[PDB]
Design a protein around this ligand. Structure first.
Ligand SMILES: Oc1ccc2c(c1)OCO2
Ligand SMILES: Oc1ccc2c(c1)OCO2
Ligand SMILES: Oc1ccc2c(c1)OCO2
Lengths: 141, 142
């Protein structure tokens, strides 16, 4: 459970946003990429796995994930790739709209949205953020 | 403090690597960029602060860090701008060379080195990696 990430793509203004969600916490990592190629996807995963302990990724089984370049990346990083195994994308586009008018470029609006999402307290003032939840869940002490 | 980072640049292959080290842990975030511009620096900072609770960043004297875009990003993100972390930097550049050949582009080699550094257990049985240390520091703070 703590090592499981869900990857999805979202398309906005003709650009591609790759989103990784840590399933247990709702914490997100996201980047605008040129296009869903095997090299860009592998690069994204390698970055993700270098920053958090990624054991398993669930993907939508897009052609970018069937590429050997992605399989090679997952192998090197020790990630179990789970293709086709079953709503951030709505939440995030919402937040992206709240900040869109503060950023010249979409890529910046995306990172602002990531920031807001991960810092937001869920479940009343007594609750916690996705950021707080992921470190609590992943901490080994 | 859990909120303190040190940022620095390294110039390699006519490229710039931006490196941020979480001071208390040795954990690193790094990106390869075409050039050390105000725009790229501000973007790097926004990404960092959205992923980890960044309170203060220590930087070099660069004109990039005082640009208006960086100031706007730091204001929005709540970031304040201002001898072993120099080591994590020489460590990283060493790992880069030890893997640089395994990869086509510099940036792949850089992210491989970040992976190796952050996952690497320090000390014997009983040791921790930098990645485990940052998570433990922040979880304890919360
Ligand atoms: O461990 C974290 C604590 C707070 C955060 C976070 C991670 O992402 C943004 O906010
Ligand atoms: O983005 C942040 C989230 C939590 C924090 C912080 C910054 O400073 C201390 O606590
Ligand atoms: O337990 C870990 C926490 C963060 C990490 C990691 C392991 O490897 C890279 O980043």
């Amino acid at each position: 459970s703590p090592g499981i990430w869900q990857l999805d793509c979202t398309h906005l203004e003709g650009k591609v946003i790759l989103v990784a969600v840590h399933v247990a916490s709702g914490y997100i990592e996201a980047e605008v990429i040129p296009a869903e190629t095997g090299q860009e996807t592998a690069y994204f995963l390698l970055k993700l796995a270098g920053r958090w302990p990624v054991k398993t990724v669930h993907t939508d089984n897009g052609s970018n994930f069937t590429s050997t370049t992605v399989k090679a990346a997952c192998d090197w990083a020790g990630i179990k790739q789970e293709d086709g195994i079953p709503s951030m994308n709505k939440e995030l586009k919402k937040i992206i709209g709240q900040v869109r008018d503060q950023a010249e470029h979409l890529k910046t609006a995306v990172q602002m949205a990531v920031f807001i999402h991960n810092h937001k307290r869920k479940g009343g003032i007594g609750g916690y953020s996705a950021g707080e939840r992921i470190v609590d869940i992943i901490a080994t002490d």
